[PDB]
Chain A
Amino acid sequence: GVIEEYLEKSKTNKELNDKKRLATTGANFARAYTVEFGSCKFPENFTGCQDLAKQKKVPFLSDDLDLECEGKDKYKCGSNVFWKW
């Protein structure tokens, strides 16, 4: 090679760079830097309203983890009254 000024005037720089908000990643799921969402509380279908829905709700989904466990329902089989149709 051969140098004239100055390996640099202004040194190495913005090539790693992150600084004020070193953000991307830690952040993005800056939906959820705080997966904060809803109510508190409580009644029902939360998951707003964006998100949605509740799709089939109670213990389900939510699980997620809805919460909680309820004198239900209680999933197990038979019912839902397989309401289809």
Chain B
Amino acid sequence: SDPEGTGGFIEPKWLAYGEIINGRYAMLGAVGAIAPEILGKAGLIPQETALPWFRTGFINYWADSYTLFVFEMALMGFAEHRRFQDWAKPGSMGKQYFLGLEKGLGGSGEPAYPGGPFFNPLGFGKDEKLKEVKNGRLAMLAILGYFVQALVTGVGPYQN
């Protein structure tokens, strides 16, 4: 049958709750701070013809370049909509191998978190003494947002 797409007060919000959750670790720059020593800046159009920003940043880059940028975001977007179909369910994913009884070996199950199950029961001594895990990382997202253009330039920190 024809594919589905139910709107209803607030799908737009479940997938809109989700969009920012992904963007909260695609926040990247300060979540994984080792990520950019200077990688937040993409480094457009600075040909051995010419130039970057403008006075920039200039004492954008060496680089990790290239092409094959569309093929990625498309091809691995050709997976985002599969853990969205496959586990509609009727399970058989573990096609195993025709012969061989020696395949008890499992791996996990369906995972969310420390894995197959949680696992290794046995725990607490010290470590010690649903959306807040969402809310605070747009309070990390939209923050670099203005920090791209984060300048007064002609002048600077009035505050100071």
Binding site for B on A (CB under 8 A): 55-56, 60-61, 63-65, 77
Contacts and interface: CB of A to CB of B under 8 A. Distances in A.
Contacts, number: 8
A55 B59 contact: yes
B41 to A, nearest CB: 14
A60 B57 CA distance: 12
A65 B37 contact: yes
Task: Name the prevailing secondary structure of the A interface residues.
Answer: loop
B4 to A, nearest CB: 49
Contact of A60 (B37, B59, B160): B59
A64 B61 CA distance: 10
Nearest to B156: A77
A77 to B, nearest CB: 7
Contacts of B160: 77
A64 B37 contact: no
Interface string B116-160: 000000000000000000000000000000000000000000001
A20 B160 CA distance: 61
A65 B59 CA distance: 9
B8 to A, nearest CB: 52
A60 B58 CA distance: 10
For the complex of A and B, the 7 pairs showing the least CB-CB separation, nearest first, are A61-B59, A60-B59, A63-B59, A55-B59, A77-B160, A64-B59, A65-B37
8 contacts: A55-B59, A56-B59, A60-B59, A61-B59, A63-B59, A64-B59, A65-B37, A77-B160
B52 to A, nearest CB: 15
A58 B37 CA distance: 18
Interface in B36-57: 37
Nearest to A56: B59
